[PDB]
């Protein structure tokens, strides 16, 4: 099935958290936080059209 | 593990109206040699659970260590560890069954058959069985090894269905268990005359009887 | 799979059967049991399933990397030594697999053809002629081979060997693809064996 | 309290189990060229037909060390194994000699092997990727 | 060498209706010629209107069901309590089964539920994950007896599309009664789970105990 | 340092084998990372001879045998209009009723088709995985993947597990602008063979009578494939062009 | 002559390519069995007679290879009838036991028949168990078959020296019933045969159901 | 063309009639049902053993008729088959035989089956022999009804054979069916 | 030795005393771990004052004992009461000549006016040994020391009864294949006397 | 004093071991046509792959009879077995029925099998040489 | 268990008495039928008043005993004299955790001021059992009855010495793998006393 737009956005944010402790408790992966922002536009059957 | 060396034969158990009864003999065999007399195979956990173990004795002692460690870890930083946060029979069985299946999946099994008996905090009877393969099941009467072939037919005549449970008193169930133990002593070559019994009742709690002996043996018709 | 090779005075001729796997009927026109290691060094291989193809492609990748890095071409002797080392290494920790390779090249520093054969255990032998997969072509090669034979005489001897092979095989033997390595590089004999 | 090493067999396999040689084109598959193992070595072949003593020999010293740490924990407390492990980690972590393979003197002193020799000491022991930079990347985890 | 597999032979049957599904199974748990228990259910409600059964080696089936239910819990946690469709559940179960490709579960798995359009759906799995959607499937020891009974009774004879829930329940009960009369491993009891738009309903019937 | 103390601070978890992260992931304790692996993790018995164990325990009463794909005749060939794939669609019967037609051809994506042979589960699982890999590759490179690359990916994958127990034989067929039409055959032995005409299964000799020329029209090619399958023996037909595969049915 | 060994090598080449009880009571003996006949897991017959008649007052019930059991019982019955005609006397259970034991020992266990034999003769009532290899044993109550453990448990529960005919019949019926309920090999009905001293044998087909 | 081993045999009892049917191979001779006056025998398994048993039983029934001066009855033939099978205790024939018939004096229908060493299974409803189809027994169990008329019995057994053949090997399958009454025997072929 | 054959895991004793001989045994017959018969009589009579106990294969020993009894009846028809030595010789010949096909061991106890009580043992293989006392069976291994410490020549009848009872009680206690009641036969000039002792009696020794 | 038959295996073989079917053209070789065994049965094939119980069953009665004779010799003397053997020889020698295979009544009386039945009694059982004259030649030894 | 490995076919006894404990053994080490060492000392000291005897594989038991002695030295450096129960627990853990790779059985005899003499047995497999007395080895099977008939609680030192001497003499008499001299260690509050008895002394008992 297609992944929800909010689920993909949450996964990306969890990746961005990697300059500290991970969302599931993983060790640090990055030395510094990211220097980029994202606009994620999607459509799913559950929530229609979404922009994050 | 990978072979049994010192073993115990069988454990039997049944439900009655207000609780459960379990029993097992006190022998550890070394093949055809009846080596160790005085092996306790009923392990009381908490004030409400009894675990009966048949099979490898060293693995049984390992399981006893695990149960004691579980009891100790339950009370770790727990004020009401004996009032409202005490261990339930279902919790103990779930842990034991998980261990048995995990060690089966590792090709490193514990060569035992385990019966958990007790009363839940709401008064419900608990009686379940697990073995070395991780197979679990429940029934109003349970037995391991030779008992499964001889004790169960005798016990099912008293408690054959769920509706029979409210009609069975503690006296009738205890008499049935004693007769089944006598039959096992008659027809099992690795059995012992000495056995222990445990009654778990939602009103009277835990009663543990040791040093019970098979009596009223019909050794009289062998003269002719 | 059967492979043959003859080193004649100025070149090396390698013949490989255009066979196919068993159980599946395939219509194809290509030489799938031969990899060009370098513009003047060719390798033919025979043996079991994809292990041999994996090994041949690995060898080809390594040799191409060397050629790119040094802007130079390894001699056939060095190529054969590297192949022997890699084949010996590949079976140091696993059950050996059936493989046999013929390496034919033309050394331009020495300006002469060279031919080597390596078996499944990693034994490298320099030979004037060689074969693998045949249950005799050895006597035909011994009686009709001379060191100073031209390319045409080597092709005639190869044709005689092919006829001898085909006289004891079914019609399922479609044919043999023949390639020649010499001072001008590697070419394919599109006419016949 | 183990003597012979136990639990040596692998329980799960995958095509990306060796993180250091993953292919850049297909990250789920290994890079056979940079493996430099001969090019015909599937991972499955490493699961069968092994010498039964190889696993015992490869994990013997670690098993003895773990038993020693467990004994220290039982008799002295948590602090003693904690300190031994901390010292060993500190010594092993700050040693980086890409051109040498011999162990440090301080490691041998900590392991009480100052005047001891085994066959690992006598016998301590390409086209692609056997240089300093590969060791730098592996050490730094980049 | 230690043998990690066993056998607790039972019988299960899944049928897809027009707007409902049924999954039934016998409650007998046995070892060789002995009876371990006469009421040990093998058909479970896994949430989101999905019923599951894994017949064969009981420990492997219990482990598979436990893993699937835990995965469903995490799916609800990670996707805003989204309802898991039957096809997604089938895909998850295929992955769970194939994860043990070199040490497989010794079970045959049937799941049942309602598809996106509201029609009944049943999925059948091979031990290593090969799965397909089917109108009806019987598995276990007495499948070769149950299937001819249904084939004689129904046409896939009133068509299956126009049968009601009660008629399907009656057909399942009759087929299991016949199998109990003919097969030694079948008896004691029969449990049926029915999935409709209102949820999951359980029914139980007694069988011969000899 | 405190992590070392926790490692040396205390049994129950060790017996549960849940001190290992892989066991926690496989049982979905810490989340659903098990369902997030691009390369699947395959369980093996922790013994000296996993291969012998699997071979002994697979070659032996209930319906719990590993399902084997149909040995029915399948044909694939290439012409100037694309690729024709024909499969005899005789369906075996058992203790089940099919909801709809059973497909013996896996649709990897709207442009790639595969053929099942040997183990049905192996073919289905690994061709779905190959479809995922191809989708990721096309997203990365912003271009449709060539048939050679996908066939090589599948071949490398099956070669990494060679001898473990996998059994599969597939034909990857695709039409790209650079390569034209292309057919590869890949089996569990690691062989990867490019070809023009492939006939697999029982009766392959009869179906290998393909009257074949590179100038056949689409209708002529479909008729030839249908006739070849009938000679081998309904028939399921697929026509693969640069714009994708089209299912005809016959 | 005798049983043939032909096609033994051919068969090798081709290959390369129940609850039964017996109970004694104060004036006789009782034998009982179930009526379920199966071919694997399939119930072939729900009403099968497993009690066989060696002689009018000597009966038996067997397990193992069914054809061997039937053939051996019939052969011993023919021998017993001929011997009784020759001696002009009622046959004895001991004689049938001797014939069965020697015949089974001759074949070195290759005849797979395991028997319970009950009978009444002018010397009294007798009950014996017979093994395939030729060993025999005496007892007051015996069980045989896949359900023999449950039946033996019931027998050990409710057996005593002073048993009347009705008590013995009830005990045998209960043992067979336990084997019926707790064993997948049994289950349909109970057949009984009562042999009392000084009276005719009484054969009760489907005593319970 | 020379592979004829295996097959199935089905016998059923109706009201004052019996039915015995067997499978038959395709066209371009070997039938597995034989008769000995009014007793029918169907044999499944190894073809050479089937031929041997048919020849031996023809021999024995001819001698029996010459001596007794009367045709042999189904019960006596069943006992003879059992004893003959048991004679080869250690070298047994690889066969499954089925016997059907009507007793002349009493008129009672009779069917029976045998194992490879002669153990007798006397059934009141039906007998199935062969391992060609596992669901054939289930289909017979689902279709059989007691006390059927000869037309109804023929329809039931023919439908069972057709349904068994449909979910099995095809393209040449045939059937031979015998309906036996006290005084009339009808033999029919099914090409479906 | 044969596959799926009944074995004899018994406890057998035979003791010579002042007035004659006593033969004693347990009463347990088992199939693996299941007790097939708990009241079996193991004291086999081959002549009026010549008795034996058997070990090994049950069928082979029963056949040998029947042949020996027939042989002794034939001998008695000619020369009267046979001696214990003659019966032991017949047993030995039957066991030794068939040792490649039969597994049998026999303990023979006899009384006669000339020799006044004798014991012979024929273990597996067919050799014969004459002894003042003999033990055999799976449970005998556990009482080798005790008997060696408690046997005396020319004991009285009661002392011999007590010695056998104690030894067999220990053998039953430690051997899983032995159990039930203790059965004894006393052979003297006065006649044959049968004795039985029950578990509740000897378990309190 | 044997119970199970012993010494059943053959120790020597030859092409003329069966004297009754020797070829007249080559007296050292057997006559395969008159053997009537199918024509493809070498004697060597009879030395291997036999059922282990066949020899025991074929020689059982003779073994029991020999044991009985030995017992008579030990207990009664030489005269008793001598007389039993003489009676049996006299009875067997004067019986010649080429058209029948059943044993005589007197033989059964001597063998004490008047009212005894075994499987040999129930189951007592060409182009060339199965006539009266072959039996005459074998009986008379001409 | 390993091919071509030295086994321990010994006779081991440990008896608790009024003043403490006594551990006794024979002195025979054999390779098949050949006697490799007839004066071997089998009484292993792991602490000043904690001794043991070993059965099974000789190498495995020696390694386990060395590790146990090292463990007890570490314990003594911290808390002083260990108890017999602690040593038995360490032995049990080592035997049980390695039971898939090592074959070992241990009899432990100890004395301490609190418990006043204890005996523990750890048979093959790794289970532990506390007993008033224990026997082990190939020769123990022959003295199961005798010991059961002759052990009493709270015996004097001389009575315990005599009981052990008689039991081990019988074990040596009947077991081919046992022989030589009898070695004993007496552990009481007074100290450790070593005793040896020669064949010409105990063979006349």
From Swiss-Prot, chain B:
BP terms from Gene Ontology: proteasomal ubiquitin-independent protein catabolic process; proteasome assembly; proteasome-mediated ubiquitin-dependent protein catabolic process
Subcellular location as annotated: Cytoplasm; Nucleus
Keyword Nucleus: yes
GO cellular component: cytosol; nucleus; proteasome complex; proteasome core complex, beta-subunit complex; proteasome storage granule
Source organism superkingdom: Eukaryota
Entry keyword set: Cytoplasm, Nucleus, Proteasome
Protein task: Non-catalytic component of the proteasome which degrades poly-ubiquitinated proteins in the cytoplasm and in the nucleus. It is essential for the regulated turnover of proteins and for the removal of misfolded proteins. The proteasome is a multicatalytic proteinase complex that is characterized by its ability to cleave peptides with Arg, Phe, Tyr, Leu, and Glu adjacent to the leaving group at neutral or slightly basic pH. It has an ATP-dependent proteolytic activity. PRE3 and PRE4 are necessary for the peptidyl-glutamyl-peptide-hydrolyzing activity.
Additional detail: Present with 16900 molecules/cell in log phase SD medium.
Family: Belongs to the peptidase T1B family.
Listed name of the protein: Proteasome subunit beta type-7
Species of the source: Saccharomyces cerevisiae (strain ATCC 204508 / S288c) (Baker's yeast)
Designated gene of the protein: PRE4
Curated annotation (Swiss-Prot), chain C:
Presence of keyword Cytoplasm: yes
Keywords of the record: Acetylation, Cytoplasm, Nucleus, Phosphoprotein, Proteasome
Coiled coil regions in record: none
PTM sites of type Phosphoserine: 75
Highest taxon, organism lineage: Eukaryota
PROSITE patterns: PROTEASOME_BETA_1 (PS00854), PROTEASOME_BETA_2 (PS51476)
Compartments where found: Cytoplasm; Nucleus
GO biological process: proteasomal ubiquitin-independent protein catabolic process; proteasome-mediated ubiquitin-dependent protein catabolic process
GO molecular function: endopeptidase activator activity
Keyword Mitochondrion: no
One Pfam family in the UniProt entry: Proteasome
InterPro entries recorded: Ntn_hydrolases_N, Proteasome_beta2, Proteasome_bsu_CS, Proteasome_sua/b, Proteasome_suB-type
GO CC annotations on file: cytosol; endoplasmic reticulum membrane; nucleus; proteasome complex; proteasome core complex, beta-subunit complex
Known partners and oligomeric status: The 26S proteasome consists of a 20S proteasome core and two 19S regulatory subunits. The 20S proteasome core is composed of 28 subunits that are arranged in four stacked rings, resulting in a barrel-shaped structure. The two end rings are each formed by seven alpha subunits, and the two central rings are each formed by seven beta subunits. The catalytic chamber with the active sites is on the inside of the barrel.
PANTHER family reported in the protein's UniProt record: METALLOPROTEASE TLDD (PTHR32194), PROTEASOME SUBUNIT BETA TYPE-1 (PTHR32194:SF2)
UniProt miscellaneous comment: Present with 21800 molecules/cell in log phase SD medium.
Family: Belongs to the peptidase T1B family.
Protein name: Proteasome subunit beta type-4
From Swiss-Prot, chain F:
Compartments, as annotated in UniProt: Cytoplasm; Nucleus
GO cellular component assignments: cytosol; nucleus; peroxisome; proteasome complex; proteasome core complex, beta-subunit complex
Chief location of this protein within or outside the cell: cytoplasm
EC numbers: 3.4.25.1
Alphabetical keyword list: Cytoplasm, Hydrolase, Nucleus, Protease, Proteasome, Threonine protease, Zymogen
Known function: The proteasome degrades poly-ubiquitinated proteins in the cytoplasm and in the nucleus. It is essential for the regulated turnover of proteins and for the removal of misfolded proteins. The proteasome is a multicatalytic proteinase complex that is characterized by its ability to cleave peptides with Arg, Phe, Tyr, Leu, and Glu adjacent to the leaving group at neutral or slightly basic pH. It has an ATP-dependent proteolytic activity. This unit is responsible of the chymotrypsin-like activity of the proteasome and is one of the principal target of the proteasome inhibitor bortezomib.
UniProt-recorded name of the protein: Proteasome subunit beta type-5
From Swiss-Prot, chain G:
Keywords, in A-Z order: Cytoplasm, Hydrolase, Nucleus, Protease, Proteasome, Threonine protease, Zymogen
GO CC list: cytosol; nucleus; proteasome complex; proteasome core complex, beta-subunit complex; proteasome storage granule
Primary localization: cytoplasm
GO molecular function: endopeptidase activity; threonine-type endopeptidase activity
Subcellular location: Cytoplasm; Nucleus
Enzymatic class: hydrolase
Known function: The proteasome degrades poly-ubiquitinated proteins in the cytoplasm and in the nucleus. It is essential for the regulated turnover of proteins and for the removal of misfolded proteins. The proteasome is a multicatalytic proteinase complex that is characterized by its ability to cleave peptides with Arg, Phe, Tyr, Leu, and Glu adjacent to the leaving group at neutral or slightly basic pH. It has an ATP-dependent proteolytic activity.
UniProt subunit comment: The 26S proteasome consists of a 20S proteasome core and two 19S regulatory subunits. The 20S proteasome core is composed of 28 subunits that are arranged in four stacked rings, resulting in a barrel-shaped structure. The two end rings are each formed by seven alpha subunits, and the two central rings are each formed by seven beta subunits. The catalytic chamber with the active sites is on the inside of the barrel.
Protein name (database record): Proteasome subunit beta type-2
Naturally occurring in which organism (per UniProt): Saccharomyces cerevisiae (strain ATCC 204508 / S288c)
Full-length numbering of the shown residues: 2 to 221 of 261
């Amino acid at each position: 099935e297609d992944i929800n737009v909010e689920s993909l956005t949450q996964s990306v944010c969890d990746l961005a958290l990697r300059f500290g402790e991970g969302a599931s408790g993983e060790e640090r992966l990055m030395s510094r936080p990211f220097g980029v922002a994202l606009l994620i536009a999607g459509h799913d059957a559950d929530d229609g059209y979404q922009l994050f | 593990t990978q072979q049994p060396i010192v073993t115990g034969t069988s454990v039997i158990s049944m439900k009655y109206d207000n609780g459960v009864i379990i029993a097992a003999d006190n022998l550890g065999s070394y093949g055809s040699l009846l080596r160790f007399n005085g092996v306790e195979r009923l392990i009381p956990v908490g004030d409400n659970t009894v675990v009966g173990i048949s099979g490898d004795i060293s693995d049984m002692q390992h399981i006893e260590r695990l149960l004691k460690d579980l009891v100790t870890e339950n009370a770790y930083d727990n004020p009401l560890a004996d009032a409202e946060e005490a261990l339930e029979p279902s919790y103990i069985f779930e842990y034991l069954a998980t261990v048995m299946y995990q060690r089966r999946s590792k090709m490193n099994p514990l060569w035992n058959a385990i019966i958990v008996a007790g009363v839940q905090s709401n008064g419900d009877q608990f009686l379940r069985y697990v073995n070395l393969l991780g197979v679990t099941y429940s029934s109003p009467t349970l037995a391991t090894g030779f008992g499964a072939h001889m004790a169960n037919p005798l016990l099912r005549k008293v408690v054959d269905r769920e509706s029979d449970i409210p009609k069975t008193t503690v006296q009738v169930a205890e008499e049935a268990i004693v007769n089944a133990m006598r039959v096992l002593y008659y027809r099992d070559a690795r059995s012992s005359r000495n056995f222990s019994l445990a009654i778990i009742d939602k009103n009277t709690g835990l009663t543990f009887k040791k040093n019970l002996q098979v009596e009223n043996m019909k050794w009289d018709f062998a003269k002719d | 799979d059967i492979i043959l090779g003859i080193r004649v005075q100025d070149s090396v001729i390698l013949a490989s059967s255009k066979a196919v796997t068993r159980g599946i009927s395939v219509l194809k026109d290509s030489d799938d049991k031969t990899r060009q290691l370098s513009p003047h060094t060719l390798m033919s291989f025979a043996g079991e399933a994809g292990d041999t193809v994996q090994f041949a492609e690995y060898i080809q990748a390594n040799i191409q990397l060397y050629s790119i890095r040094e802007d130079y071409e390894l001699s056939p002797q060095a190529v054969s030594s590297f192949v022997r080392q890699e084949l010996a290494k590949s079976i140091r920790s696993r059950r050996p697999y059936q493989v046999n390779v013929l390496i034919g090249g033309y050394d331009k520093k020495k300006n002469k053809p060279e031919l080597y054969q390596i078996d499944y255990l990693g034994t490298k032998v320099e030979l004037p002629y060689g074969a693998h997969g045949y249950s005799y072509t050895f006597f035909l090669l011994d009686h009709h081979y001379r060191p100073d034979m031209t390319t045409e005489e080597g092709l005639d001897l190869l044709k005689l060997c092919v006829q001898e092979l085909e006289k004891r095989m079914p019609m399922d033997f479609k044919g043999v693809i023949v390639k020649i390595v010499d001072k001008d590089g590697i070419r394919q004999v599109d006419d016949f064996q | 309290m183990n003597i012979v090493p136990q639990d040596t067999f692998k329980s799960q396999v995958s095509t990306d189990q060796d993180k250091s040689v993953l292919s850049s084109a297909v990250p789920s598959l290994p890079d056979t060229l940079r493996q430099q193992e001969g090019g015909a070595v599937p991972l499955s072949t490493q699961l069968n037909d092994r010498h039964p003593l190889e696993s015992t020999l490869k994990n013997w010293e670690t098993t003895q060390r773990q038993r020693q740490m467990e004994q220290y924990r039982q008799i002295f407390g948590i602090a003693e194994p904690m300190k031994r492990t901390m010292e060993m980690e500190i010594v092993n972590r700050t040693d980086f000699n890409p051109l040498s393979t011999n162990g440090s003197i301080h490691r041998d002193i900590l392991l009480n092997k100052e005047c001891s020799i085994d066959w690992e000491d006598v016998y301590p022991g390409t086209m692609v990727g056997d240089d300093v930079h590969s060791k730098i990347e592996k050490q730094l985890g980049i | 060498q230690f043998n990690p597999y066993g056998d607790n032979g039972g019988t299960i049957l899944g049928i897809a209706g027009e707007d409902f599904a049924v999954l039934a199974g016998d409650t007998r748990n046995i070892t060789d010629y002995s009876i371990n228990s006469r009421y040990e259910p093998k058909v479970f409600d896994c949430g989101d209107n999905i019923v599951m059964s894994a017949n064969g080696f009981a420990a492997d089936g219990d482990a598979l069901v436990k893993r699937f239910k835990n995965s469903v819990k995490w799916y609800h946690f990670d996707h805003n309590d989204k309802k898991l469709s039957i096809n997604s559940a089938a895909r998850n179960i295929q992955h769970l089964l194939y994860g043990k490709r070199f040490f497989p579960y010794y079970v045959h798995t049937i799941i049942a539920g309602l598809d996106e359009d509201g029609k009944g759906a049943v999925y059948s799995f091979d031990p290593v994950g090969s799965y397909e959607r089917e109108q009806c499937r019987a598995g276990g020891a007495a499948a070769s007896l149950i299937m001819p009974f249904l084939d004689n009774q129904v046409n896939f004879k009133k068509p299956l599309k126009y049968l009601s829930v009660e008629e399907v329940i009656k057909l399942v009960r009759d087929s299991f009664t016949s199998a109990t009369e003919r097969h030694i491993q079948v008896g004691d009891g029969l449990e049926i789970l029915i999935v409709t738009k209102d949820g999951v309903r359980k029914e139980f019937y007694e069988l011969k105990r000899d | 340092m405190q992590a070392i103390a926790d490692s040396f601070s205390v049994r129950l978890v060790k017996e549960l084998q849940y001190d290992n992260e892989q066991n926690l992931e496989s049982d979905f304790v810490t989340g659903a990372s098990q369902f997030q692996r691009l390369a699947p993790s395959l369980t093996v018995p922790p013994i000296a001879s996993p291969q012998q164990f699997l071979r002994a325990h697979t070659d032996d009463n209930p319906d719990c045998k590993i399902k084997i794909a149909h040995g029915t005749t399948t044909l694939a060939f290439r012409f100037q209009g694309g690729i024709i794939v024909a499969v005899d669609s005789r369906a075996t019967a058992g203790n089940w009723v099919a909801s709809q037609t059973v497909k013996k051809v896996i649709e990897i994506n709207p442009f790639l088709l595969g053929t099942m042979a040997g183990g049905a589960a192996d073919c289905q699982f690994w061709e779905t995985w190959l479809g995922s890999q191809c989708r990721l590759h096309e997203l990365r490179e912003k271009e449709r993947i060539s048939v050679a690359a996908a066939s090589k990916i599948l071949s490398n994958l099956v070669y990494q597990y060679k001898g473990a127990g996998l059994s599969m034989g597939t034909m990857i067929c695709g039409y790209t602008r650079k390569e034209g039409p292309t057919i590869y055959y890949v089996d569990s032995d690691g062989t990867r063979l490019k070809g023009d005409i492939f006939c697999v299964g029982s009766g392959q000799t009869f179906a290998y009578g393909v009257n074949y020329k590179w100038d056949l029209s689409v209708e002529d090619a479909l008729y030839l494939g249908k006739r070849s399958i009938l000679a081998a023996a309904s028939v399921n037909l697929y026509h693969v062009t640069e714009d994708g595969w089209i299912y005809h049915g016959n | 002559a005798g049983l043939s060994f032909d096609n033994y090598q051919r068969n090798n080449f081709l290959a390369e390519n129940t609850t039964i009880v017996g109970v004694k009571f104060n004036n006789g003996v009782v034998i009982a069995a179930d009526t379920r006949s199966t071919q694997g897991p399939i119930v072939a017959d729900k009403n099968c007679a497993k009690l066989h008649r060696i002689s009018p007052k000597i009966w038996c019930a067997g397990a193992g290879t069914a054809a061997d059991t039937e053939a051996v019982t019939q052969l011993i019955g023919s021998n017993i009838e001929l011997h009784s005609l020759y001696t002009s006397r009622e046959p004895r259970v001991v004689s049938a036991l001797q014939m069965l034991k020697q015949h089974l020992f001759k074949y070195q266990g290759h005849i797979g028949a395991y028997l319970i034999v009950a009978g009444v003769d002018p010397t009294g009532s007798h009950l014996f168990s017979i093994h395939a290899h030729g060993s025999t044993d005496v007892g007051y109550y015996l069980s045989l078959g896949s359900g023999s453990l449950a039946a033996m448990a019931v027998l050990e529960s409710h057996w005593k020296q002073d048993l009347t005919k009705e008590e013995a019949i009830k005990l045998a019926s209960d043992a067979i019933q336990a084997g019926i309920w707790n064993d997948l090999g049994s289950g349909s009905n109970v057949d009984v045969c009562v042999m009392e001293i000084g009276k005719d044998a009484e054969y009760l087909r489907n005593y319970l159901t | 063309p020379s592979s004829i081993n295996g097959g199935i045999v089905v016998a059923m009892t109706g009201k004052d009639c019996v039915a015995i049917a067997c499978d038959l191979r395709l066209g371009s001779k070997f039938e597995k049902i034989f008769h000995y006056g009014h007793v029918f025998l169907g044999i499944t398994g190894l073809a050479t053993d089937v031929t041997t048993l048919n020849e031996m039983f023809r021999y024995k029934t001819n001698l029996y008729k010459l001596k007794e001066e009367r045709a042999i009855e189904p019960e006596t033939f069943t006992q003879l088959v059992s004893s003959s099978l048991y004679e080869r205790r250690f070298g047994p024939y690889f066969v499954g035989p089925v016997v059907a018939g009507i007793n002349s004096k009493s008129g009672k229908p009779f069917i029976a089956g045998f194992d490879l060493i002669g153990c007798i299974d006397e059934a009141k409803d039906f007998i199935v022999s062969g391992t060609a189809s596992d669901q054939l027994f289930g289909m017979c169990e689902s279709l059989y009804e007691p006390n059927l008329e000869p037309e109804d019995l023929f329809e039931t057994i023919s439908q069972a054979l057709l349904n068994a053949a449909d979910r099995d090997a095809l393209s040449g399958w045939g059937a031979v069916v015998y309906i036996i009454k006290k005084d009339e025997v009808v033999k029919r072929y099914l090409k479906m | 030795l044969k596959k799926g054959e009944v074995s004899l895991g018994t406890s057998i004793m035979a003791v010579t005393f002042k007035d004659g001989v006593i033969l004693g045994a347990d009463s347990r017959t088992t199939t693996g771990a299941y007790i097939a018969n708990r009241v079996t009589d193991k004291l086999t009579r081959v002549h009026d004052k010549i008795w034996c106990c058997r070990s090994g294969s049950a069928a082979d020993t029963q056949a040998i004992a029947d042949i020996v009894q027939y042989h002794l009846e034939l001998y008695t028809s000619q020369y009267g009461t046979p001696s214990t030595e003659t019966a032991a010789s017949v047993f030995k010949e039957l066991c030794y000549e068939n040792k490649d096909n039969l597994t049998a061991g026999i303990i023979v106890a006899g009384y006669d006016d000339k020799n006044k009580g004798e014991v012979y043992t024929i273990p597996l293989g067919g050799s014969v040994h004459k002894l003042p006392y003999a033990i055999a069976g799976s449970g005998s291994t556990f009482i080798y020391g005790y008997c060696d410490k408690n046997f005396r020549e020319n004991m009285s009848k009661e002392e011999t009864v007590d010695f056998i009872k104690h030894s067999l009680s220990q053998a039953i206690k430690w051997d899983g294949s032995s159990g039930g009641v203790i059965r004894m036969v006393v052979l003297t000039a006065a006649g044959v006397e049968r004795l039985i002792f029950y578990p509740d009696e000897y378990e309190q020794l």
